[PDB]
Amino acid sequence: RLQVEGLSGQLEKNVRAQLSTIESDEVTPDRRFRARVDDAIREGLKALGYYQPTIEFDLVLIAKVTPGVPVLIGGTDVVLRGGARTDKDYLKLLDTRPAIGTVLNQGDYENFKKSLTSIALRKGYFDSEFTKAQLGIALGLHKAFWDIDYNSGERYRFGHVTFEGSQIRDEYLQNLVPFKEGDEYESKDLAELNRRLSATGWFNSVVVAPQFDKARETKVLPLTGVVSPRTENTIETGVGYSHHH
Incomplete structure (x- = not known):
């Protein structure tokens, strides 16, 4: 011990x-x-x-x-390029950076990078990339310097939703889709699409797959929704009996 x-x-x-x-x-x-x-x-x-x-x-x-002796924060340099430069969520994130002169916490730097990517995922910045991401420690100065240069690219927009396997006519499914084609992507919309399909009780299974290989040139993200019709699940004991004797 x-x-x-x-x-x-x-x-x-x-x-x-x-x-x-x-x-x-x-x-x-x-x-x-x-x-x-x-x-x-x-x-x-x-x-x-x-x-x-x-x-x-x-x-x-x-x-x-x-x-x-502690290493202190000497700088938290972050450059945001693409939509992120003027995106309210990325701007809010910048204001969470630690102040110059505070004791280094490496987890702040790592969590910040993870937050960049988390926002990108939620808002459809699927071309998101870093051209710089270093934590530099000048121990002779006891200072640490962030250096992040982050490019979110453009926000992807939803494309058309194609349904397969349905017993329901397509115009009724389309009416359930909680966005219009051309709307900017939000992850919560995929959850809402699932919820709306679910609420109908029409299906036993629903699998909704974003078609990303259709989207890199266009930045328009089609979805495919593969469904199965709900089948009745009741206790079969209606059928009568032969002679018992």
């Missing part, structure tokens, strides 16, 4: 997380082992801005860790 001394809060939690990965109570080393522990502690600390800790062990095994 191993116990960490010298950390207060999120540092301490992240480091305990990192440590609760390797085995403890067992038959194990003393120097090769505590050099795995040493590595794991340093990994946790780096993620939270501490690249130059001091760590010292004892005897259960207790590790005296002093975080040391």
